[PDB]
Amino acid sequence: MELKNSISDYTEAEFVQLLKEIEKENVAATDDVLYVLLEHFVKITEHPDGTDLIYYPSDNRDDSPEGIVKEIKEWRAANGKPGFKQG
């Protein structure tokens, strides 16, 4: 797909499409492409726990694409960082 440079370039729905793309490579024969997608996820979210949001979700939230997006929204908002594109 198309990897944007900033989280602000992504609508919430668009970010979910990236998560499913990652979920697809997760079950691929190798991790070559997966690691590239995970690096991008880490760079744009800027979240300190990086891929843990995907592979080690907190029990206080749903382990799903929607749960991931929710945690990202709350962390970035609490830290005064720009959020997802309203579009």
Partner: protein
């Protein structure tokens, strides 16, 4: 990669935090319920063994429940689960299978009692 052979061993009973000790010391052992599923079975190589190992983990109700959905999906196709970020080391970001007594000396390739699960960080540390 390696040579064919049959799996042997018994492993050990584990709690609901199976890989909590991953890496530390010798890491986590092969669950006994998993050994019972792989014992006596033949494998084309250790890689084929590793793929069959994680697949069995995904089918064991008491073990898969200890992993996230994304990690269970990885194991279902024979891949090792991703470790927490803090346990990653370079391109190596998933749990690795380590032989206590290296293939070099003596051996014990498919011996589940000589196999354990460790993190990338400690996998290097121990060496």
């Amino acid at each position: 990669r390696n040579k064919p052979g049959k799996a042997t061993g018994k492993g050990k009973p584990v709690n609901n935090k199976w890989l909590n000790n991953a890496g530390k010391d010798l890491g986590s052992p092969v669950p006994d319920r998993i050994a019972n599923k792989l014992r006596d079975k033949e494998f084309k190589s250790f890689d084929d063994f590793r793929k069959k190992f994680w697949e069995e983990v995904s089918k064991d109700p008491e073990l898969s429940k200890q992993f996230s959905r994304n990690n269970n999906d990885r194991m279902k196709v024979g891949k090792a689960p991703q470790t927490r970020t803090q346990d990653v080391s370079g391109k190596r970001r998933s749990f690795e299978l380590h032989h206590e007594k290296p293939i070099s000396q003596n051996g014990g390739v498919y011996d589940m009692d000589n196999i354990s699960v460790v993190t990338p960080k400690r996998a290097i540390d121990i060496h």
